Design a protein around this ligand. Structure first.
Ligand SMILES: *[C@H]1O[C@H](CO)[C@@H](O)[C@H](O)[C@@H]1O
Lengths: 4, 323
């Protein structure tokens, strides 16, 4: 998997 | 003075790290995210079917509603969420924020719908980028800061082992040697810092800036840097099924290091092997493209090698190798  | 330790646990392959948070008496498993400043949770305002497989907050029970307030956010991977806002008591590792704004989800995109590992996010970026309207709110950390023994938090994320979030104090047994600090630029609301140079295996290059982000799984760098890295990995190829560059799991990977204010932060090649790409005999690389956004994302891959102090005085970040 994710990219916050 | 207050301090506390919250233990985090990685999900499968260390995709995300979750930590329990008690809101108005209900404990939820949240993903702590130093790249955003919103505390939002799955709630009873979502369709019953989306509440499935999650611990949900029921605002009616204990929250105080902020009438007319909304929030809405879009993340780096295409995910988004929106809702309304309540204040409640929020406890993390025995530290309680009274009157903390809790962003109740009313809508969530499929990425969140499908992820049953977490019940929402706790943002730890600077409050300047909280999305609540018409008046933005403070993060949990900004809320409790003045009551902590020291206005800082520190993190030790580990590979397939429980780690910690230390609030208000530094645990010297979590790292080797002394911390090295570097100044932070919070003008965009992030824990942004400068690297003087990098070394990818056999190639070294010029510095750049990046953000320390516990909510990003990988180490996202400029495509030129990614090319230089993978040019040194026999058989590396991109696989859109997997999510980027993949290679034979038994590959010997080069180390990756950055020089920060005189300190060399090294990510050993074994940590750059993220895991099974989930498609044949390959593994996904822990280093991937930042998609040309102009800054790097020092995600979990990078963080699993260091003990990092996020200090509001400066502000500044301290680094040392994990013990
Ligand atoms: C963190 O620090 C506080 C203040 O020193 C302690 O009371 C707490 O037990 C923990 O060590």
């Amino acid at each position: 998997x994710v990219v916050x | 003075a207050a301090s506390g330790v919250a233990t985090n646990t990685p999900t499968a392959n260390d995709e995300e790290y979750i930590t329990p948070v008690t809101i108005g008496g209900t404990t939820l498993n949240l993903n702590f995210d130093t790249g955003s400043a919103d505390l939002w949770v799955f709630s009873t305002e979502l369709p019953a079917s989306q509440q499935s497989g999650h611990s949900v907050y029921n605002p009616s029970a204990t929250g105080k509603e902020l009438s007319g307030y909304t929030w809405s956010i879009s993340y780096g991977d295409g995910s988004s969420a929106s809702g309304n806002v309540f204040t409640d008591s929020v406890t993390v590792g025995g530290v309680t924020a009274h009157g903390q704004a809790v962003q109740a989800a009313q809508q969530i995109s499929a990425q969140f719908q499908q992820d049953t590992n977490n019940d929402g996010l706790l943002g730890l970026a600077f409050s300047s980028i909280n999305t609540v309207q018409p008046q933005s709110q403070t993060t949990f950390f900004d809320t409790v800061k003045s009551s902590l023994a020291q206005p800082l938090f520190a993190v030790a994320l580990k590979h397939q082992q429980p780690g910690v979030y230390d609030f208000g104090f530094i645990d010297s047994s979590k790292y080797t040697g002394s911390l090295t600090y570097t100044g932070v630029d919070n003008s965009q609301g992030f824990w942004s810092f400068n690297v003087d140079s990098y070394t990818a295996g056999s190639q070294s290059g010029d510095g750049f800036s990046g953000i320390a982000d516990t909510g990003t799984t990988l180490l996202l760098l400029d495509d030129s840097v990614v090319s230089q890295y993978y040019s040194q990995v026999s058989g590396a190829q991109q696989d859109s099924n997997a999510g980027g560059y993949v290679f034979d799991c038994s590959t010997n990977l080069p180390d990756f290091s950055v020089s920060i204010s005189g300190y060399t932060a090294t990510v050993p090649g074994s940590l750059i092997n993220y895991g099974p790409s989930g498609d044949g005999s390959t593994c996904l690389g822990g280093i991937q493209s930042n998609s040309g956004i102009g800054f790097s994302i020092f995600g979990d891959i990078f963080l699993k090698s260091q003990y990092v102090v996020f200090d509001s005085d400066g502000p500044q970040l301290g680094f040392a190798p994990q013990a």
